[PDB]
Structures are given as structure tokens and as C-alpha cells.
Amino acid sequence: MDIRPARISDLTGMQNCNLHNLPENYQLKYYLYHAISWPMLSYVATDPKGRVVGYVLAKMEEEPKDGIPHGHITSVSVMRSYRHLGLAKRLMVQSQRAMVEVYGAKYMSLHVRKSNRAAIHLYRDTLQFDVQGIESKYYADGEDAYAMHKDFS
Amino acid sequence: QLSPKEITLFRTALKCYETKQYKKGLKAIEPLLERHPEHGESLAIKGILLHSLGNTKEGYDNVRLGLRNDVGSGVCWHIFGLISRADKDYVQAAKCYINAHKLEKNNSSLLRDLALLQSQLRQYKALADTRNALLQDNPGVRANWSALAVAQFLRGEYASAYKIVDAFESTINQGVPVDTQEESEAMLFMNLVILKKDGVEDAYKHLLSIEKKVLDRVAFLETRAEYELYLSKMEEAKSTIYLLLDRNPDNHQYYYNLQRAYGYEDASGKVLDSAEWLNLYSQLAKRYPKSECPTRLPLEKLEGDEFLTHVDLYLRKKLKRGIPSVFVDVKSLYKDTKKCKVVEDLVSKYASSLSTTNKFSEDDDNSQIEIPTTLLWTYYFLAQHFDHVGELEKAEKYVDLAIDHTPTLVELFMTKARISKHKGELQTAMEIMDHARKLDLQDRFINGKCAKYMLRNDENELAAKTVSLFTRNEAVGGAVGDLADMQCLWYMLEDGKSFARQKKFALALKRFSTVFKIFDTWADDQFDFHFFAFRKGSLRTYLDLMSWEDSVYDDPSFREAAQGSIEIYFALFDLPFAKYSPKLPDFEKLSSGEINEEEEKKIYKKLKKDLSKRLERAEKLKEADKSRKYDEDPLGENLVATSEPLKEAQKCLEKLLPYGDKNPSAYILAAQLYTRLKNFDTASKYLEQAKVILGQNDPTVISTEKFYNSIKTQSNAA
Ligand SMILES: CC(=O)SCCNC(=O)CCNC(=O)[C@H](O)C(C)(C)COP(=O)(O)OP(=O)(O)OC[C@H]1O[C@@H](n2cnc3c(N)ncnc32)[C@H](O)[C@@H]1OP(=O)(O)O
Ligand SMILES: [Cl-]
Ligand SMILES: [Cl-]
Ligand SMILES: [Cl-]
Ligand SMILES: [Cl-]
Ligand SMILES: [Cl-]
Ligand SMILES: [Cl-]
Ligand SMILES: [Cl-]
Ligand SMILES: [Cl-]
Ligand SMILES: [Cl-]
Ligand SMILES: [Cl-]
Ligand SMILES: [Cl-]
Ligand SMILES: [Cl-]
Ligand SMILES: [Cl-]
Ligand SMILES: [Cl-]
Ligand SMILES: [Cl-]
Ligand SMILES: [Cl-]
Ligand code: NA
Ligand code: NA
Ligand code: NA
Numbered sequence: 001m002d003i004r005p006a007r008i009s010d011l012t013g014m015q016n017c018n019l020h021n022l023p024e025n026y027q028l029k030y031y032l033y034h035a036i037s038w039p040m041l042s043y044v045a046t047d048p049k050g051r052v053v054g055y056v057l058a059k060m061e062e063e064p065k066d067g068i069p070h071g072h073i074t075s076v077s078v079m080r081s082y083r084h085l086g087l088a089k090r091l092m093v094q095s096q097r098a099m100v101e102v103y104g105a106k107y108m109s110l111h112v113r114k115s116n117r118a119a120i121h122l123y124r125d126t127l128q129f130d131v132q133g134i135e136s137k138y139y140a141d142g143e144d145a146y147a148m149h150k151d152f153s
Numbered sequence: 154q155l156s157p158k159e160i161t162l163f164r165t166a167l168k169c170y171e172t173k174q175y176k177k178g179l180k181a182i183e184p185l186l187e188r189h190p191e192h193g194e195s196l197a198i199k200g201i202l203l204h205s206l207g208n209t210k211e212g213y214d215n216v217r218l219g220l221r222n223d224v225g226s227g228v229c230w231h232i233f234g235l236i237s238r239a240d241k242d243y244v245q246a247a248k249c250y251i252n253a254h255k256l257e258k259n260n261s262s263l264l265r266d267l268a269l270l271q272s273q274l275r276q277y278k279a280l281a282d283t284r285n286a287l288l289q290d291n292p293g294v295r296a297n298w299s300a301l302a303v304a305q306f307l308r309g310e311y312a313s314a315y316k317i318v319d320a321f322e323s324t325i326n327q328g329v330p331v332d333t334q335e336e337s338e339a340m341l342f343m344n345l346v347i348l349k350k351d352g353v354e355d356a357y358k359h360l361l362s363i364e365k366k367v368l369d370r371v372a373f374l375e376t377r378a379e380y381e382l383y384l385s386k387m388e389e390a391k392s393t394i395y396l397l398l399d400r401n402p403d404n405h406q407y408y409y410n411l412q413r414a415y416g417y418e419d420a421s422g423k424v425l426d427s428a429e430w431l432n433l434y435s436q437l438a439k440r441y442p443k444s445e446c447p448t449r450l451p452l453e454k455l456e457g458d459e460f461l462t463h464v465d466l467y468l469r470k471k472l473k474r475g476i477p478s479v480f481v482d483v484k485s486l487y488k489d490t491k492k493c494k495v496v497e498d499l500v501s502k503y504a505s506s507l508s509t510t511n512k513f514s515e516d517d518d519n520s521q522i523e524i525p526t527t528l529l530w531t532y533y534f535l536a537q538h539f540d541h542v543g544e545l546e547k548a549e550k551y552v553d554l555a556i557d558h559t560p561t562l563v564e565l566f567m568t569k570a571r572i573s574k575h576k577g578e579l580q581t582a583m584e585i586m587d588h589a590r591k592l593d594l595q596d597r598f599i600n601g602k603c604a605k606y607m608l609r610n611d612e613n614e615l616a617a618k619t620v621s622l623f624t625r626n627e628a629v630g631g632a633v634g635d636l637a638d639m640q641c642l643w644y645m646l647e648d649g650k651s652f653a654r655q656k657k658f659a660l661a662l663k664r665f666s667t668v669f670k671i672f673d674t675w676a677d678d679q680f681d682f683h684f685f686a687f688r689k690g691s692l693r694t695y696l697d698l699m700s701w702e703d704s705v706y707d708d709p710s711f712r713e714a715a716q717g718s719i720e721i722y723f724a725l726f727d728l729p730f731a732k733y734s735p736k737l738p739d740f741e742k743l744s745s746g747e748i749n750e751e752e753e754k755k756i757y758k759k760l761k762k763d764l765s766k767r768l769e770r771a772e773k774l775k776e777a778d779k780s781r782k783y784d785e786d787p788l789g790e791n792l793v794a795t796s797e798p799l800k801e802a803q804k805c806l807e808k809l810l811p812y813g814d815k816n817p818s819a820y821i822l823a824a825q826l827y828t829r830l831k832n833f834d835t836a837s838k839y840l841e842q843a844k845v846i847l848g849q850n851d852p853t854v855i856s857t858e859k860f861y862n863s864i865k866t867q868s869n870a871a
Pocket of ligand 1: 022074076078083112116117
């Protein structure tokens with residue numbers, strides 16, 4: 001229930017939260033890579049015992065499209081127990097603010113599989129994302145991915 | 154030495170190494186070396202190529218023979234440092250780079266690499282000297298300045314760090330960018346230097362001066378509030394913290410800080426102004442109601458009648474909304490066990506109110522309205538509650554009430570499975586969990602929990618099939634092979650512990666060794682950031698990375714895997730039949746020693762043949778990995794066949810001991826280890842250390858000492 005900027009010490013906790021609800025995983029060095037390259041972009045939700053419950057792994061695009069800077073959500077999830085609370089929405093708005101203020105991001109982007117109803121309903125409806133397009137067989141299982149964009153204007 | 158024709162080939166040998174594909178380079182080395190074996194540098198280039206593709210000591214032999222032949226040459230030392238760093242032997246690699254640089258002082262790249270090794274080995278003394286020599290080589294780049302200041306900051310020399318940052322910052326009078334992000338992060342680091350040297354007073358003044366330069370708005374404001382609270386500037390902290398709540402009113406520490414600024418709360422406990430303390434939180438309800446903190450946070454410190462009033466409104470609030478997480482939220486309030494009864498009796502009354510009416514209690518019928526589905530979440534709360542309290546009879550009765558109402562809800566079956574687990578019945582617990590998974594096939598979470606309960610019931614293969622649904626099954630040992638690559642700690646631990654109680658030691662040792670490998674990887678992952686962090690200029694973050702890695706092996710997961718490995722290594726030493734990983738029925742027959750020599754020989758003949766079949770199976774697996782480079786030699790049997798399990802147990806104990814004061818079990822295991830090693834003075838001291846903490850009446854202490862007395866008096870004879 002405590003949301004806050006992510007630290008180095010809670011990176012492994014984010015990885016665990018990712019290994020629990022996503023198919024869709026990276027090794028810790030890539031989390032380390034996010035912390036060092038963009039230290040204030042990632043946020044974390046925490047249970048009373050100090051363990052990571054939800055998170056948002058955020059970054060700025062290393063190779064920007066057309067030269068305009070923009071943010072990218074690489075991963076976000078909440079443990080099944082703590083869902084339907086507002087944790088994800090609140091994690092996103094904190095990370096979004098940091099993208100704009102620190103890095104001057106003109107927009108933000110992510111990928112979602114077409115069959116994920118909870119995710120789409122989160123971005124397109126409550127977070128006001130637009131569907132930029134569809135990427136064929138983006139995921140390992142061959143499922144198509146919606147490319148979502150939120151323009152800041 | 155000195156030939157014109159061989160030079161063109163000697164260079165192609167090196168160029169081929171840089172471009173990888175080491176087969177071509179070796180082709181340029183061989184013709185020259187067979188007729189000139191005494192060239193040191195030459196043997197070395199042959200070695201690293203034979204090392205680079207592999208494998209492995211074939212290279213080391215050519216390297217070491219070449220390094221002995223040329224005393225003498227920085228080329229031989231540089232390459233020896235390369236293969237050492239490649240093989241993760243850092244103390245040896247660092248010693249190679251210093252010798253490589255002593256022979257070639259004008260080569261700065263060696264120092265650039267050396268600093269990485271010295272940062273990894275946490276040699277702050279030599280690191281500073283190296284970062285300094287690099288700064289003198291290229292004072293132009295900002296990174297080399299930060300690297301020296303940070304290295305000096307880590308040594309505790311804050312003053313020297315201050316001069317370095319201040320010297321550089323003055324060399325740019327025009328600007329402002331630069332990066333503007335490097336500048337922002339550098340200033341925060343400079344403010345950290347000042348705070349660590351000139352105290353909080355100076356650090357606060359400096360922070361206010363650099364406000365225009367800091368891009369990270371949260372980092373600034375949080376650091377400001379920490380300072381303003383320390384200097385007892387309450388009116389300033391009051392407003393600053395308010396800026397933080399505006400940005401993120403879900404951050405608990407902000408409320409604890411705002412309360413402290415008003416003086417309604419001390420640095421530790423909340424004293425006093427208990428009336429105005431609530432009043433603040435009531436005004437914090439004006440902070441847009443989208444935040445639950447103003448109502449929830451006081452529930453921690455409230456008591457008596459005012460707690461009952463607020464916990465009632467809070468519970469009703471989440472019950473009417475139908476939040477499944479309602480118990481997990483309130484759950485932490487049970488720390489005092491008095492509120493536990495209060496909450497228990499309150500929601501028990503919620504249960505029988507919804508009986509005749511649809512409204513809570515009695516007097517709520519005067520305020521009318523009604524609720525249709527609240528009985529579910531009341532039942533579900535009570536189901537979770539009594540399971541936590543440990544009733545299990547009352548608990549299971551409630552889930553059934555919830556399931557009878559709505560059979561399609563997954564969470565209801567999650568709790569019921571837990572209760573069966575607490576009842577000691579694992580088989581039915583596993584089945585219920587699988588039924589819950591069947592209710593959601595697209596959710597990896599419910600799938601993972603299902604595999605866990607399968608593991609707890611010692612169905613390893615059934616669990617592997619279950620996780621095979623959500624894993625990338627391309628290459629290495631299936632779903633489980635992928636779970637190891639993704640550093641999934643819980644599965645390797647649960648799988649290994651399962652093999653452990655099934656007396657399958659080879660596989661248990663395998664799973665535990667993977668946890669070892671995961672932690673070794675995490676410890677090693679920081680290596681590249683001893684360079685990259687100064688390129689991005691994330692200084693305060695790099696500091697956290699360094700301090701995190703220092704205690705990285707102090708973890709429940711590593712402890713459990715190390716403890717489990719040592720326990721199995723003890724069994725390998727004690728029982729001669731443990732190496733064959735006997736089946737549980739076969740394990741108990743040989744452990745009882747009541748069987749005759751006729752039956753005993755029969756079991757061993759079977760156990761050996763079955764081992765051979767596993768060994769034969771392992772080879773087919775290795776052939777599979779190879780054809781698909783780095784393979785895996787131990788498919789699980791290599792560990793359990795160790796010549797001395799005591800040594801391996803001793804290795805596993807290495808990273809346990811430094812944290813042994815907070816985890817006295819490490820001292821106990823140590824005592825048990827050296828007792829078997831016939832080294833009693835080293836065994837007794839560890840036993841004594843474990844006796845100081847938690848000891849005297851402790852069961853694990855007396856059983857170890859009893860074991861200690863049995864072996865020590867057995868060293869002699871009477
Ligand atoms: C780039 C990313 O990796 S894309 C893929 C994201 N990862 C996953 O989906 C993994 C598994 N799922 C989850 O972890 C979570 O369900 C998340 C991250 C999708 C949502 O997080 P939550 O905290 O539970 O949702 P949150 O409460 O913050 O957001 C609110 C909205 O989410 C929507 N929502 C959340 N879960 C669901 C659901 N199961 N069904 C329908 N809608 C849902 C609601 O519409 C809700 O709107 P509301 O304001 O009217 O209540
Ligand atoms: Cl990386
Ligand atoms: Cl727990
Ligand atoms: Cl925390
Ligand atoms: Cl960037
Ligand atoms: Cl990307
Ligand atoms: Cl919103
Ligand atoms: Cl020192
Ligand atoms: Cl600097
Ligand atoms: Cl000093
Ligand atoms: Cl405080
Ligand atoms: Cl009370
Ligand atoms: Cl559990
Ligand atoms: Cl998993
Ligand atoms: Cl068990
Ligand atoms: Cl360094
Ligand atoms: Cl550098
Ligand atoms: Na991961
Ligand atoms: Na999949
Ligand atoms: Na890197």
C-alpha cells in the first residue's frame with residue numbers, strides 16, 4: 001500500500017514480482033541497467049513487510065524515433081492479491097511525471113498482447129493511451145502486440 | 154626474437170582475437186610456434202585463443218608457459234589478466250593488470266580495466282590511486298573526475314572528495330550543459346559529500362543553492378524535508394512535505410514526516426497531541442480522497458473506542474466495495490493481538506446481521522439502504538481470518554459458505570487450499586490449488602502457486618509440466634531450465650527441498666547449486682557498472698549498488714539453499730549409501746541397519762545399477778545441450794558423488810558465517826561441521842557463539858553439543 005520510487009535494494013523484489021505475473025522476464029542485470037541509466041523513472045508498491053508487491057519498470061528510449069525523446073514502460077505488474085486497488089495506475093502516474101520533468105519526454109509507449117483485457121482497459125481507458133498499431137507475432141508464443149502511445153499535450 | 158616475416162603473422166594473431174572467430178588466428182600462430190616454442194608472447198596468444206573458444210586449461214598451460222618464458226612482457230601479463238577476468242578470478246586478474254601496466258606505463262586502457270577489478274574487489278585504497286592516474290591521463294572528460302571523487306568518497310575521505318568535485322565544477326564558468334542530467338546528479342552527490350563532511354547545517358544551505366540545477370524533483374524535496382526536520386525548521390518542513398504529498402499522497406513516510414513537522418509525533422513514537430494528531434489526518438482526508446492513507450494509517454496507532462469506531466467504518470468501506478484484498482490490508486493490525494479480537498468480533502457480527510437483514514449490526518436498519526453481495530467478502534474475510542488465527546475448522550466452514558454462494562471465484566479456492574495445507578493434508582491441498590488454476594488459465598500467478606503446492610506434495614514432474622505453460626521452452630532443460638536462466642529463486646528452492654525429503658540428493662544438490670549460481674551472478678552483475686555508471690553519471694545510485702552488493706549474500710534464499718546443501722553433505726559423509734540417492738523406502742531400510750547382509754547386498758546392487766542408468770541418462774542430456782558455446786556438465790549427479798562432502802559443506806558455509814550473529818544457525822552448522830572434521834577447538838567456539846545468542850535452553854544447541862560430546866569422547870578409547 002506504500003508506493004514510492006524504486007531503489008537498488010528492491011530491484012530483486014521487482015524481478016520476483018515479474019517472475020510471478022509475467023511470461024516475459026529479464027535477468028537482474030537488465031533491472032540494474034534501468035536503475036543506473038534512469039534512476040528516478042521506476043516506482044514500487046510495498047506491503048507491510050517491506051517486500052515488493054507491484055512495480056513499474058520504466059525507461060527513456062535509447063534510440064528515439066525520429067529524434068524526439070519518449071518514455072517506455074518495459075514492465076509493470078501487481079501480485080494477484082493486491083490487484084483491483086489502483087496500485088498500477090498510481091505507479092504509472094508517478095513514473096510518467098518523472099519522464100516529463102527529468103528527461104523532457106514528449107510521450108510514452110508500451111506493448112500489450114491483444115488478449116490481455118485487464119492491461120488494455122488500464123492504458124486505453126483509465127490512463128488515456130492511444131493504440132498506435134499492431135505488431136504481428138511480437139511475443140514468443142506468437143501472439144500479436146498492441147503498440148500503445150500516450151502523447152503529452 | 155626479431156624476425157620481419159613472423160611479425161605480419163604475429164599481428165594477425167592479435168587482430169583475430171579482437172574480431173573473435175579464433176580459428177583463423179590459431180592458424181596464424183601454429184606454423185611459427187612448432188619450430189619456435191620458446192617465444193613467450195607467442196605461447197600466450199595461442200593460449201587465449203585456445204581459451205576463448207575453449208576449453209580450457211589447454212589455454213592456461215600455453216599462457217603460463219609463455220608468461221614464464223617472457224618475464225618480462227606486458228603482453229603476456231595482459232592476456233593472463235584477460236582469461237582470469239573471463240573465468241571470474243578477479244584477485245588474480247587485478248594482479249596481472251598491475252604487472253601489465255608496470256611493464257607498459259603509457260597504456261591507459263590497462264588502468265581503465267584495473268579500476269573495474271579494484272572496484273569489484275572493494276580495494277578502495279588502490280582504486281583511488283588508479284582513478285587518480287586516469288584523471289591525470291585525461292582530465293578532459295568529466296567521468297574521470299566523478300570516478301575519483303566517488304572512489305575517495307568510498308574510502309571515507311570526504312574532504313578530498315569535496316576538493317575534486319569543487320575543482321571541476323569551477324572549470325566550467327559558461328555552460329550550463331554539458332548533459333544537465335550529469336550536472337543534476339553531480340550536485341546531489343556533492344550535497345552528499347558536504348552532508349557527510351560539514352554536517353547537516355551546511356548541506357541544507359548548499360541544497361537550497363543548487364535547487365535550480367536539480368532535475369530530480371522528488372530527490373530534492375525529500376532530501377530537503379530530511380534536512381529541515383533535522384534542523385527543527387518545522388514550518389519549512391511543513392510546506393515541503395506538503396509538496397511531496399501533492400505529488401504522491403501514497404507515500405507512508407511523508408505522513409510520518411508531516412506529523413513530525415507539526416510536532417504531533419516524535420522521531421520514533423507518536424507523542425502526543427493525540428486529538429490534533431487525528432485532526433491532521435482528518436484534514437488529510439481533504440487531500441483528495443483517492444488516497445486511503447489518511448484513514449488507514451491512524452488505524453495503526455489508534456486504540457480502544459476510537460479504534461473500534463474507525464475500524465468499523467474502514468471495514469464497512471472495503472466490504473461494500475467488494476475488495477478481495479480487504480483482509481491482507483487489515484492483517485498487519487494483528488501485531489498486538491488485542492485488535493485481532495476486536496476485528497474478529499466485529500466481522501463475526503457482520504456475518505450474522507446479513508442473516509435476516511442486508512445491513513450490518515442492528516442500528517444500521519435505521520439508516521436503511523442494503524447490500525446484496527457483502528456476505529461473500531465477509532465470509533472470505535472470516536475464512537482468511539481464522540486460517541491466520543489458526544482455527545481451520547471455523548475457517549474451512551466459511552470458505553465453503555463462500556464457495557457455495559459463488560463457485561467461480563478463484564480467490565476462494567486459494568484460501569481453501571491453504572487451509573488444507575495447514576490441516577497437514579497436502580494432497581487435497583494440491584488438488585484445490587489446481588482447481589483454482591483451472592479457473593484462470595491465462596494468469597501466470599495462479600499457475601505458479603499451483604506448481605508450488607505440487608512441489609510441497611513432492612510432485613516435481615507434475616509441477617514442471619504445469620509451469621511449462623508459462624515459460625519460454627526454447628532450449629535448456631524445459632520449463633525448469635528456463636526458470637534457472639531467469640533467476641527464479643523460489644522454484645529452485647522449493648524443487649530442491651522437495652528432492653531433499655525424497656532423499657533424491659543429486660537433484661536436490663543441483664537445484665540448490667542453481668540458487669548459488671544465481672547469487673554469484675547477482676554479485677558479478679555490478680562489474681560493468683564500475684565503468685557505465687560514471688558514463689551516465691548516476692553517482693548516488695552507484696553508491697547504493699555498491700552497498701547493496703556488500704550484503705547481497707545475506708538473504709533468506711541463499712541461507713536456505715546453503716543450509717540445505719550442507720545438510721545433504723552431512724548425510725553424504727555419515728551414510729555410505731547416500732551417494733546413490735536411494736528411494737525413501739530403501740533409505741529407511743539401510744538406515745535402520747536391522748536387515749541382514751543378504752538383503753543389504755541386494756539393495757546396493759540395485760542402487761548402483763539405477764545410478765548407472767541416471768549417469769547414462771545424463772550423457773544423453775549433455776549430447777542434447779551440446780547439439781543446439783557453453784554447456785552444462787553436471788546434469789545433477791556430479792555434485793553428490795564428491796570425494797569429500799565436508800569440503801563442499803565448508804564452502805557453502807563461507808558466506809553464511811559473516812551474518813551469523815543475526816542468524817545463529819550458521820554457528821550451529823559450523824559446530825556440526827568441524828565436529829565431524831575432528832577439529833574440536835574450532836568446533837566448540839562456534840558452538841559457544843551459538844550458545845550466547847538464543848542458547849542455553851535452545852533445542853538445536855543441546856542436540857549439537859550432545860553430538861559434539863559423542864564424537865570428541867570417541868576420538869579416544871576406554
Ligand atoms: C508493458 C507491460 O508489461 S504490459 C502487461 C502488464 N502486465 C500484466 O498484465 C500481468 C498480470 N496483471 C497485473 O499485474 C495487473 O492486473 C495489472 C498491472 C494489469 C493492473 O494492475 P492493478 O493495480 O490491478 O489495476 P489498477 O487498479 O491499478 O487500475 C485500475 C483499472 O484497472 C482495470 N483492471 C484491473 N484489473 C482488471 C481486471 N482483472 N479486469 C478488468 N479490469 C481490470 C480496471 O478497469 C480499473 O479501473 P477502475 O479505476 O474503474 O477500477
Ligand atoms: Cl544490460
Ligand atoms: Cl508471509
Ligand atoms: Cl520497502
Ligand atoms: Cl536517455
Ligand atoms: Cl525499447
Ligand atoms: Cl487516472
Ligand atoms: Cl583507505
Ligand atoms: Cl563532477
Ligand atoms: Cl574528512
Ligand atoms: Cl520521522
Ligand atoms: Cl483497541
Ligand atoms: Cl502460500
Ligand atoms: Cl514461476
Ligand atoms: Cl512440506
Ligand atoms: Cl569506481
Ligand atoms: Cl569511466
Ligand atoms: Na524477470
Ligand atoms: Na505463454
Ligand atoms: Na551495460
